[PDB]
C-alpha cells in the first residue's frame, strides 16, 4: 500500500512530523463519546481504553495525517486538537501500520482495528493536548482526568481550570448520562409506562470505577466514594463508611483510607485516614497552597487535618487541626532533631505556622483542655 | 360528546362543584402503583409524574365526576379520596375534555392519554387531599411525600404522621419494591437458578432520584444519601462522603452538603454543611421545637449542631453545640447589635438559651479548653 | 429403591454414621459457585438458601455418602469438606430421600429437587465444617460468613482468620464477580463497542444484601453499608450517611445505627450509634481484646468509642473515648454501687482502666476543658 516495510513506515513519520508548525502531542487518545439524547452535539462524556502520554509519537503523527490528508486544518499553536473519527481516517490509519498488522502488542493499533470493526459515525473522537493549559473542550477535560485517574501524571501537575463550567450536570444510570432536560420531556410517558430509569446520580462528573481498572491489591469498597480524576497508589483501600477521594486528589503509597480527601489533597504511603477523619484540600487566602500529608501519618478518627503535614505525623482522634488553632508545644528538643531548620524558640504556634513540619502529635490535654503538639514518640526511631 | 365547547366544558364543572357537599381538593394526582408480589393488595411504592396543589380544580372535579358518574361514593368530608382508575374514568375524563384535545400544554389531559394508552387494571389510581391531616393510605403518604421533594408545599408544612406504621419494609430492587416473604419463599429457586436479585436496600421509604429531577443546577451525587421526602432548593449540592438528607429536611437556598440534615432540619440560603458535620433535627423534651440554620451559615467538618442557629453563625470543625453544652460569651457588645432583644447580661450561656440568635461564632479556647461563643467578624459587615 | 420407608432411611443412616473415621458435620450446605472468567478453577464467590448448623445430620450423612459411593476419600480429620457436585450425587441423595418425596418442608430435600432441575457441571459443590478452625477454602469462608450473618453462631464465635488470603480482589457489578484480568484483558473491546460493565466495586468481600434476607422489622437503608459476615440483630436499622458494619461485627439487638462498627465489635440492644461515631473494634496490643458496647448505649453523633462500653453508658456527641484519654471521675459513690468490684480511689482514669463499666458518662467540662467520666443519671433508675 505504498508503506510495506517499518522503514517506509518510518520515513513517513519523518514527513508528517517535518509538515510545517507540526508538534507532537504530549498526550493522546481515541475517544467513545456520549452524546446528548436531545441535543445531540453536547458530549455528556468520553471514554478511552487507552491513554498515550509523552509516548507512541509515531501513532499521534499516523492519526493527525489521517485528518491533515482529508483537508483538515490543525492549529499546532492551539493547546489542544479535538476531531471526530471517520472510517476513512481509521482505514487511512490501518494502511501506514500495513508493516505491524500481523504482530502482536501494539496496542494503539489494536484499538484502531477494534474501531473499525465497531465503527459508526460520530461516536469516536481522537483527543490530543499539545501543551498543558486549560481545558477548551469536555473531550480534553476527559483525557486530562484520565492522565490523573491512570497515574501517567502526578496528583496536581494539570491545568483543569474552567473543567466545572465546560461539563454539563446530567443524570446518570448505569454508569450512562442522561440530559435532565430528557428526563423532564419525557417523565410522564416513562413514569406511566413504568420505564423511568434508575438514577443513581446527578452532577458534573462520573465515578473513577466507571473508567480505571484498579491495581490487583487496590480496593474501592464502593465506587460512590471516589471520582473520576482521583489518583490512587496501588495497595490502597478506600473503605465505604464515611470516606471521600475527590478529583485531583489521593495517595502516593498505599494507604488505609476511611476519611475523605479533597481536591489537592495529598497523602503519602503507609498514612492511615482514619474513620470520618476530614483531609482538607486547599489552604485559606489568595495564594492558599494545596494540603499535602507525608508518609507514615496517622489520622484519627472524626480528626480534622487542615494543614500540611510533613512525614510521620499523628492528629489523635475527634481533634481538629485547623490553620487558626493554637497549639501548646512540647517536646521542643527532640521536634528540632526531626526539623532542624524550625525555630522553635515560643510556646505556643498556630496550625498554619506548623505547617509541612515532620513527626508531630496533635493531641488534647484531657485534664487541662490545652491542645498540644508534641512529638510522635515513633518518629525518633 | 355533549361537550364542544370550553364553555361548556367551565359549566359542567360548575354542575360538578355544585354538587352535595363538594370540596375542592386541596392536592391531586394519578399514581402508578407497584403491589405485593404475593400480597397484591399491598401497595409497595406510588409513582407520580404530575402533582397539583392548589390549582387545576377543574381537572380534579373532572375526575371526581368519572367515579361519581358510576356510583362511587365520595367522603367529602374525609382529609383524602384514593380510588383505582378504569379505563372507563379515563375515556369519560378525555371525552369532558374534547374541547381541549388539539391544543398543547395541557398536562393532565396529556397524562391521561398517556395512561388510556398504557392502561392495565389496578396498575393507576386518582389521589387527593381534601385538608392536611394524618395520611391514611400508602397512596397518599406517597403524595404528601412528592408535594415536600416537589417544593410544592414548604418544609414541615404538612402531615405526615404515621407515615411509618403505614409504609412496608420492602427490600428494593433497581428501585423496585420486592416484599422480603416473596424473596424468602424464592430464595432457593432464585439462588441455585442464579437468577437472584440485587438487593440495593431495605426500607420503608425510597430514594428522592427515583421520583425527582433536580433542577439543572442541583446536584446530588449519591442518591442512597437523598430520602424521598427531602427538600433541596436550586443550586444544592449534596456531596457522597458522609453526607445525608432525611425526609421533612432540606435547604431552603443552594447551600454546599457535606453532612448530615436531620428530618425537621431546614438549613438556610448560603450555608456550608461540612464534611462529616451533623445537623440534629427536633429539639429535646415534648414541645421540642424543629431545628433551622439560618443563611450564610459556615458548619465546620465533623461539627454537632443540636440548635437552631439565625444567620451568618459559624461552627468551628469538630465542635460540638448541644442544648446543654455551656459557652462563655465574649463580644457582648456587638452580638447585642445584631441580637437586639437578647439579655447579654451573664457570661456562661447554655446552647439552647443562645437559639435563633444571629452572628454567633462557637469555637474552643485552645489554651484553656473553654467553649466560647463570640461573634462572627464577618456578620457584622 | 431399596430406602421405601422412613425406617430404611434411618438405618441407612446409621451405617453411614458407623463408617470408619465418620464424624457428623458441624456445619454444612450446598453453594453455586461463581468461578473465574479467565482462570475457571478460581471460586470468586459462593452463594448458599440453606445454612445447616448442628443440625439435620441425616442429610449431611446422605450428601457424604453419595461422595463415598463413588470412591471420593474423605478425610475426617480434616477440619473441613469440600467437593463439587455430579448429577450422579444428586439423584444418588433424592433416591435415598425416597420415603420424604411427596411431602413438604424438607429443605434440604427441596434444595436437590432445585439443584437436579437446574443442575450445570460444576456449579454446585457440598461444603462443610467437622470443626472450628481456620478456612481452607473460599468454600469455608463463605460458610463461616453465612454462618454469622444467618445468626445461626454468634459473632466473634468462629475462626476466620487467613480468610483474606484466600479471597481474590475482584472487580462487582450487580453483585456478580468479575476478575480485574478479565476487564483488562477486554477493556478496548468493551470499552469501544459500549459493552463496559458497571464496576460498583472492588474487593475481596461481597455485601450482605448479596447474601441475606433481613428480618421484617430490619431495614439496611444502603447495601455498601453492611458487609457480608455483618450480624445484625432482628429490629436493627443501618443508616446510609456514614455508618458502617464489617464483617465479624454487628448488634445483639434492635440498635439504631448511623455511625460505624469495626470487625470485632458487638453493640448491645437498645444501643444508639449517633450519626458520624466510630466504634473501634479490637483493644491495641498483643492480647487486645475485642471492644463491646453494652445495651442501652447512647453514643453521640462524630463520637469515637475506643474502649469497651458495659450498659447504660452515654458518650457525649464529639467527644473521644480512647484507650488511654485520661478522665476526671465525678459521682464516685453512685457509680460503685453500679460497678461494686471496680475501685473508685483516684481522680483520674485512663479509659482502658474503665473498660466494660455500667452506667458511664463521658462529657467535656465545657468551662475547663477537662474530660469528665460521670454518671449517667437514667442509670441510677
Ligand atoms: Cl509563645
Ligand atoms: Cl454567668
Ligand atoms: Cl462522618
Ligand atoms: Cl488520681
Redesign the interface.
Known amino acids: 500500500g505504498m508503506i510495506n516495510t517499518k522503514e517506509d513506515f518510518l520515513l513517513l513519520i519523518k514527513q508528517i512530523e517535518q509538515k510545517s508548525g507540526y508538534k507532537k502531542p504530549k498526550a493522546f487518545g481515541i475517544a467513545?463519546l456520549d452524546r446528548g439524547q436531545l441535543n445531540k452535539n453536547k458530549i455528556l462524556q468520553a471514554?478511552?481504553?487507552?491513554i498515550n502520554y509523552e509516548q507512541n509519537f509515531g501513532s499521534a503523527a499516523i492519526m493527525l495525517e489521517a485528518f491533515m490528508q482529508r483537508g483538515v486544518e490543525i492549529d499546532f499553536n492551539a493547546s489542544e486538537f479535538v476531531q471526530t473519527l471517520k472510517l476513512e481516517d481509521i482505514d487511512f490509519a490501518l494502511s501506514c501500520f500495513k508493516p505491524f498488522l500481523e504482530e502482536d502488542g501494539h496496542?494503539n493499533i489494536?484499538?484502531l482495528k477494534?474501531?473499525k470493526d465497531?465503527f459508526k459515525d460520530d461516536e469516536?473522537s481522537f483527543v490530543c493536548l499539545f501543551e498543558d493549559k486549560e481545558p477548551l473542550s469536555v473531550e480534553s477535560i476527559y483525557l486530562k482526568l484520565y492522565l490523573l485517574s491512570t497515574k501517567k501524571v502526578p496528583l496536581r501537575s494539570i491545568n483543569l481550570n474552567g473543567a466545572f463550567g465546560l461539563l454539563s450536570?446530567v443524570?446518570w444510570s448505569?454508569?450512562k448520562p442522561i440530559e435532565?432536560?430528557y428526563?423532564?420531556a419525557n417523565?410522564?410517558?416513562?413514569?406511566?409506562?413504568?420505564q423511568?430509569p434508575?438514577?443513581?446520580?446527578?452532577?458534573?462528573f462520573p465515578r473513577f470505577?466507571?473508567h480505571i481498572?484498579?491495581?490487583?491489591?487496590?480496593?474501592?469498597?464502593?465506587?460512590?466514594?471516589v471520582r473520576m480524576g482521583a489518583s490512587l497508589a496501588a495497595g490502597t483501600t478506600i473503605?465505604?463508611?464515611?470516606?471521600?477521594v475527590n478529583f485531583n486528589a489521593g495517595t502516593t503509597g498505599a494507604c488505609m483510607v476511611?476519611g475523605?480527601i479533597?481536591s489537592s489533597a495529598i497523602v503519602g504511603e503507609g498514612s492511615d485516614v482514619?474513620?470520618?477523619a476530614?483531609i482538607?484540600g486547599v489552604l485559606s487566602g489568595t495564594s492558599g497552597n494545596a494540603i499535602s500529608v507525608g508518609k507514615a501519618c496517622l489520622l484519627?478518627?472524626?480528626?480534622?487535618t487542615?494543614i500540611p503535614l510533613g512525614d510521620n505525623c499523628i492528629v489523635?482522634?475527634?481533634?481538629?487541626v485547623?490553620e487558626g488553632?493554637?497549639?501548646?508545644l512540647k517536646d521542643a528538643e527532640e521536634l528540632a532533631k526531626l526539623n532542624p531548620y524550625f525555630n522553635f524558640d515560643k510556646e505556643?504556634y498556630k496550625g498554619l505556622e506548623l505547617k509541612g513540619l515532620n513527626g508531630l502529635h496533635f493531641r488534647?490535654?484531657?485534664?487541662?483542655?490545652?491542645?498540644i503538639v508534641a512529638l510522635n514518640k515513633k518518629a525518633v526511631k
Open positions: 467513545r471514554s478511552f481504553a487507552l496496542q489494536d484499538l477494534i474501531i465497531k469516536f450536570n443524570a448505569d454508569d435532565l432536560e428526563l423532564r417523565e410522564m410517558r416513562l413514569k406511566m409506562s413504568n423511568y434508575k438514577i443513581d446520580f446527578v452532577d458534573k470505577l466507571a481498572i484498579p491495581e490487583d491489591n487496590t480496593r474501592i469498597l464502593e465506587s460512590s466514594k473503605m465505604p463508611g464515611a470516606s471521600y476511611e475523605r479533597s482514619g474513620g470520618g476530614s482538607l484519627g478518627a472524626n480528626s480534622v487542615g489523635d482522634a475527634g481533634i481538629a485547623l488553632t493554637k497549639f501548646l505556643i488534647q490535654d484531657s485534664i487541662s483542655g490545652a491542645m
